[PDB]
């Protein structure tokens, strides 16, 4: 269960009771749109909002894994691969063994957290997830940083793993669609936002749900 | 969080291998258990896994990592890196593409150095252990280039992470000892040669003091 596939949009919507009878269609049927559910927008706002996670409030307050990965991407932003790789290898080796110390990253955090490029990112994003996404995107200015290199993350932190895997994708997994939409909104607004900006997640979920035909049993099952 | 390799004492409890060791036997050995030698033999025998019987008969994971290691034995880093790059990328998405190994398995399976390994090892696990050890004559090939194996095949992950190590994890002590035994005899052996794993488990269990709670349970 630490290693399941990402939920598809339809599976996400069923897992969180987000499907409804679509009464715009059920009172005004549109040709080429039959046998499709609608989405409960209010409940989806809640769900996407709860994916956003904690506000950024100093790197020392981050999770151990977010801390140590931020340090790597910092080190890369600042063009220091051996600090970056060294953290990658220690976490790799201790992943083979029982549990890792992310504490290997502390010296690199200390050295780069107040650096110009890191301070630009933190200025411009308000959530841990959206800070670190932007930190990954800047570290890929240096070169190659695939999610490969921190494969160990998926069982530790499913959400963080999916957020970081969608950096560079155009469409995110439904389980990180909230912070991804918010990250983009921050980027479009040119500032950090503490107010959740997750509407694009809802619109995309609606659309993805509209592309899937239900059976009649399934249509009657909608409330 | 992450599933840790069992210690010797946990391995021993999990397979019900501890036994009351009699009041007709050692100072400094108060509160220790003995081992059921027969039952441990059967557990280590079962860890050996299947006989090697053609590369087409291996699991998809074993097939592809074997293909990687052969490629390195024959010094084609690129086709080895391509496979690994491709299984990384691909595991990160829904399911890794083991089929990418197929071409590589076809090109080097009958090559001199692979044939020498296959000749000398009777088990899949002992074959691929030796394929990995030989792949390291080319360069560094850590289990860090195949982190994904840990959840796909735990046994194989543990076997391959033990190549280079002097003491194995208990969960692969059988095929580790067999592998050493075959390298020592200079031939493949179909009869399990797993006594070293029994002797190591006994030594390790004797270093661990039990509580009065745990001693009361022994037979």
Author numbering:
A (entry chain B): 157 to 379
B (entry chain A): 158 to 182, 186 to 379
Original paper wording:
Further binding studies were conducted with several DotM mutants, where Arg residues (single or double) on the protein’s surface were mutated to Glu. Five mutants were produced: R196E/R197E (termed “M1”), R314E/R315E (termed “M2”), R347E/R348E (termed “M3”), R217E (termed “M4”), and R262E (termed “M5”). Binding was abrogated in M1, M2, and M4, indicating that these Arg patches are involved in binding of acidic Glu-rich peptides. To ascertain that the observed binding deficiency in M1, M2, and M4 variant proteins was not due to folding defects caused by the mutations, these three proteins were crystallized and their structures were determined and shown to be virtually identical to the wild-type protein. Thus, the mutations do not introduce structural defects, suggesting that the ITC binding results reflect an effective role of the residues in binding. The final model suggests that CegC3 is primarily helical. Binding is observed between the main middle Glu-rich helical motif of CegC3 (residues E155, E158, and E159; see numbering in Table 2 and interactions in Fig. 5) to the “central patch” residues R314 and R315, as well as between R217 of DotM to peptide residue E162. Remarkably (given that acidic Glu-rich motif-containing effectors represent only a subset of Legionella effectors), the M1 and M4 mutations resulted in a significant decrease in L. pneumophila replication in the macrophages (up to 70–80%). However, in A. castellanii, M1 reduces intracellular growth by up to 90% (after 24 h) while the slight reduction in intracellular growth of the M4 mutant is not statistically significant. We observed that the M1 and M4 dotM mutants producing the reporter fusions Cya-CegC3Cter, Cya-OSSCter, or Cya-Lpg1663Cter displayed lower levels of effector translocation compared to the wild-type strain of L. pneumophila (Cya-CegC3Cter: 50% and 30% decrease compared to wild-type DotM for M1 and M4, respectively; Cya-OSSCter: 50% and 40% decrease compared to wild-type DotM for M1 and M4, respectively; Cya-Lpg1663Cter: 60% and 55% decrease compared to wild-type DotM for M1 and M4, respectively).
The T4BS secretion coupling complex of L. pneumophila comprises the inner membrane AAA+ ATPase DotL (IcmO) and two inner membrane/cytoplasmic components, DotM (IcmP) and DotN (IcmJ). In this study, we determine the crystal structure of the cytoplasmic domain of DotM and observe large patches of basic residues, leading us to hypothesize that DotM might form the recruiting platform for Glu-rich motif-containing effectors. Our results suggest that DotM’s cytoplasmic domain is capable of binding directly another subgroup of Legionella effectors that contain acidic Glu-rich motifs at their C terminus.
